[PDB]
């Protein structure tokens, strides 16, 4: 009953009430707190930023005859890494290793994430991974995603290529997370052929490519300036069958608009209208502005008349573009 109350207080943010209840139960013989209650209190203190209170509660465990486990060390390492203290997490891991405490896969993943977030070199992450592998670590799906994101955070071109190839060459690849991380890594160094490769691996892996992943691929293709690759990514998103909003349609309009023909953009709008894509007022403002600069002052007026019935609240940009088209025509 005490653990459930502590979990409810942590989910509700009642750190003060939880600390008061813990301090009251510490003096009660019939309600002595166990290691689980201490870990819950430490987590509730760390979630609110009470590092000093959490450290005091962890230190008072030996005076209260409370057993210490790898869970407390992992929670401390995670709390240290959440503030960018990679050195503190490394020191805590070294102290746990010196204390004959066998680290787990979760602790190693948390240490790697803290080192990646704190700005540590890729050599340190590689050494930590080698030490974990030499200690018989257990790989996991979230652990694989974090290991793939590590080399991406490294920022090196070779590191990005290794992050992209770790899922492919090893034969074990996640559905969306690892593919998205590898695509984001390849985008920085430059994905000459990995842009379509990540989308193909995500699609033919056994699960349809997510709308978010296909939209990210289309945005990466548009950022590079490849109109053909963006059209291919849009066609792949449409063929995949995943529920996609008009974000890719707006991206295509911004790109077709760059071309200025805006015939592809017009098609994107018609495709959004037919496939019941989520209409966006920002996309309307963007498309209208591009169309207005091109001409179509009457088409802009018709679009405004249609949006009047569409019950879409306008904005500064939409009204400004409409009145600019009206003044120019």
TrEMBL record:
The keyword Repeat applies. One of its GO terms (cellular component) is chloroplast. Keywords: Repeat. GO terms for biological process: plastid transcription. The keyword Repeat applies. It comes from the Eukaryota. PPR repeats lie at residues 34-68, 69-103, 104-139, 140-174, 175-209, 210-244, 245-279, 280-314. Belongs to the PPR family. P subfamily. This is Pentatricopeptide repeat-containing protein At1g74850, chloroplastic. It comes from Nicotiana tabacum (Common tobacco).
